[PDB]
Design an enzyme around this catalytic site. Structure first.
Site, PDB file in Angstrom:
ATOM      1  CG  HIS A 200      -2.255   0.790   0.910  1.00  0.00           C
ATOM      2  ND1 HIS A 200      -2.253   2.012   0.266  1.00  0.00           N
ATOM      3  CD2 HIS A 200      -3.541   0.568   1.272  1.00  0.00           C
ATOM      4  CE1 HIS A 200      -3.481   2.490   0.216  1.00  0.00           C
ATOM      5  NE2 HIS A 200      -4.281   1.637   0.823  1.00  0.00           N
ATOM      6  CG  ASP A 204      -4.289   4.889  -5.122  1.00  0.00           C
ATOM      7  OD1 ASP A 204      -5.000   4.174  -5.842  1.00  0.00           O
ATOM      8  OD2 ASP A 204      -4.034   6.090  -5.414  1.00  0.00           O
TER       9      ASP A 204
END
EC number: 2.3.1.168
Lengths: 229, 229, 229
Positions: A200, A204
Site C-alpha cells: 500500500h 492505492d
C-alpha cells in the site's frame, strides 16, 4: 517433539516469507468473477491444444490487465535519492507450482510479448519442469508479479504473501459452481474469488480496484480479448 | 525501469501505511449485510435530498453503533505510565475519497452531534471538496475512526489498513444483488460485506462482534434508527 | 479522552497479540463447508448428551485432521543449531471462551487421546469453568493449536491472530443457512467458512490446503469418522 531441521526450498521459502512480512505494509482487495465464458472458451480449444487451460487463460488475461495497470508491476525503492517506485517494463510472471519437493515458483520471462498460445505452451512446460525437477536457475528467478493458484488445491479464497520486492500478488480461488444473481434471477455458475494483496506504499485503493475490475471484466468476456486464438 | 519519485499525497500515504504496519497487531471480522431496506429508505428521500445516499446512511448508522461500542473509537497509548486505552468522546469520522490527485481522507468532526440530514449534507460537501481540491487542513485531520468505501470502486470485499493511531477501520464492500436465504428460500437481495480491521491490543473479538452485529442490524432495519428523518 | 489503564487478561492479550504480530509471517486459507450432516448428527445425540454440540463435533474432527496433517501442530524454532520445525506429538487444543472478564483460552490437554464423547464432555467443563472463573493455571496453558469460534458471536468470517509460538490458528465462521449449489441446483444449506491463518515459514500452501480440504470433507460426512459415537 519431532525436530525437523529446515533446508533447501523450505529454508529459502522461510527466508522469503520473513523478508516480505517485515518490509511490506499490505492491504487486500477481492472480487468475485463468473467463469462460465472462460470454461466455454477452454472447451472450444482443449481438444487441439490441451495446454489452453482456465489457469493459462487467466494468466493471459492477467498479463493484459497488468499492461493496462502498470503500477501493479513495480517495486518500492528507498536506496539512494529518497522514496521511488520503479515501474517495470517487462512482465515476468511468477506462478506457484506445488511439487513433491515443496512449492516452486517458475517464471514466464517477458510474458507481455507472448500471444495466448505462446503463453499457454510456456506455462505447460514450466508446470512439467517443476514437477520433473528440470527447471533452470533462470526459470526460477526475475519475477515482477506473482500468482498463487491455491484454487487448484481446493481453497475457496486465500491471502498469499507478496514475493518481495514485488508490489502485489494475485490469489486465484477455487473455480466451482456457486450461486450468483444474473438478470435478477439466482442461478448456478462456475465462479472464483480473486484476491490481490498489495504494497500500500506503492499501489492505492483506486489503482487496485481499477486493476481488479478490469481483470474481472476480461475473464467474464474473454473471447474478444483473446481474439489471437 | 520507469523511475517515479514519490511526493505529496503519495509520500504521506506511504508514510502512514508504514507506521500502521509496524505498530498495530491486527485482526479482522466480517459480516454480510442485506441492504434492501437501506435502498428502500434512500428511495424515499433521494428526490427531495439527493445527499441521502446509501453511503451517507451507512455512516450515520456507523456513528450510532460507535456511540454504543465506545472501545472501537479509541487509541492505544504506551507513552508514560504503562499501557492505556484512550477512549475518545468525540466521533470524528474519516472516510476515503479517491480523486485525480490520489485518495484523500476527509473528516466529519463531531459526527456524534449530527442528525441524519446534517451528516448527509456534510459528507456531500466533503466529497465535493476532495474532488475540487478545496478542503482545509482541519477537514483532513483529527479522525478517531475511518471508513474505506472500496465498494464504490467495485471491490466485493477488502482488508484496509488502520489509520494510525486509531484502533479500527471499517471497509464497505460493493452493494449488489447476491443470493441469500430468507425464511428458508434462496432469494436475490442487494447485499454488502462489512470488514472491520482492528487493533487486537485494544479491542477483543467479543467487542468487535458486538459492534459489527449491531451495525448489521441497524442497516437491515434502518427506518426506526433513522426516525430523525 | 476516557483513560483506561490496562491490566490482567487485557494486559496479557495485548502482550500476546504484539508478540505474534512481530514474529510470524502469516498467510490465510479459507474453505466453505456445508454443515447439514453435522447438525443432523448433533440432532441424533443432543437429547441423551447435551454436550454433543456442532462446536464439540467440529473440534473432534479438527483433532482427526491434525493427526493426519502433523505440520499444522508445530512450532518454528531458531534458538541454537539453525532453523528447525518442532512437530508436537500431543494435540493440546486451545479454544476461545469469551466471558464477562474478557476472553480466555482454555486448553484440552492430550485431545488426540479422547473419543468424541470424552472430548465433548471436557469442552463443556472448560466452557463452564471459563464462565464461572474456576479454571486452573494448567487448563489455560500449553496449547499446540488454537481455535477461535467467532461464529458463535455472529461473525460470518474472520482472520484471528496466531497464538504464539503455535504454527496456525483456525477461525470458525457463523453457521447459518446460505445458498450453495448441490447437483447443479441452488439450494439452502447451513454453512460455515473456515479460515486458517498459518506461519508460512512452517506450513506451505499445499500443506494447509490438504489440511483444510480434509477438515471440510470430515465435517461434510462426519457419521463414519465419528463411528465411536
Amino acid at each position: 517433539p519431532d525436530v525437523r531441521p529446515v533446508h533447501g526450498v523450505h529454508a529459502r521459502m522461510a527466508e522469503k516469507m520473513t523478508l516480505s512480512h517485515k518490509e511490506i505494509p499490505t492491504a487486500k482487495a477481492s472480487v468475485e468473477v463468473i467463469c462460465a465464458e472462460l470454461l466455454r472458451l477452454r472447451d472450444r480449444f482443449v481438444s487441439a491444444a490441451p495446454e489452453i487451460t482456465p489457469f493459462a487463460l487467466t494468466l493471459r488475461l492477467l498479463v493484459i490487465a497488468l499492461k493496462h495497470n502498470v503500477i501493479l508491476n513495480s517495486t518500492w525503492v528507498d536506496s539512494g535519492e529518497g522514496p521511488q517506485v520503479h515501474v517495470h517494463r517487462g512482465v515476468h510472471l511468477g506462478f506457484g507450482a506445488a511439487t513433491e519437493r515443496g512449492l516452486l515458483v517458475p517464471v514466464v520471462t517477458d510474458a507481455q510479448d507472448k500471444n495466448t498460445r505462446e503463453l499457454a505452451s510456456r506455462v505447460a512446460e514450466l508446470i512439467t519442469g517443476a514437477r520433473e525437477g528440470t527447471l533452470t536457475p533462470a526459470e526460477l528467478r526475475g519475477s515482477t508479479f506473482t500468482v498463487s493458484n491455491f484454487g487448484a488445491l481446493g481453497v475457496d479464497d486465500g491471502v498469499p504473501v507478496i514475493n518481495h520486492p514485488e508490489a502485489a500478488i494475485l490469489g486465484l480461488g477455487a473455480i466451482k459452481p456457486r450461486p450468483v444473481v444474473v438478470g435478477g434471477e439466482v442461478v448456478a455458475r462456475p465462479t472464483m474469488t480473486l484476491t490481490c494483496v498489495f504494497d500500500h506504499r506503492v499501489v492505492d485503493g483506486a489503482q487496485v480496484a481499477q486493476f481488479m475490475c478490469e481483470l474481472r471484466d476480461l475473464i467474464e468476456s474473454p473471447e474478444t480479448a483473446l481474439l489471437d486464438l
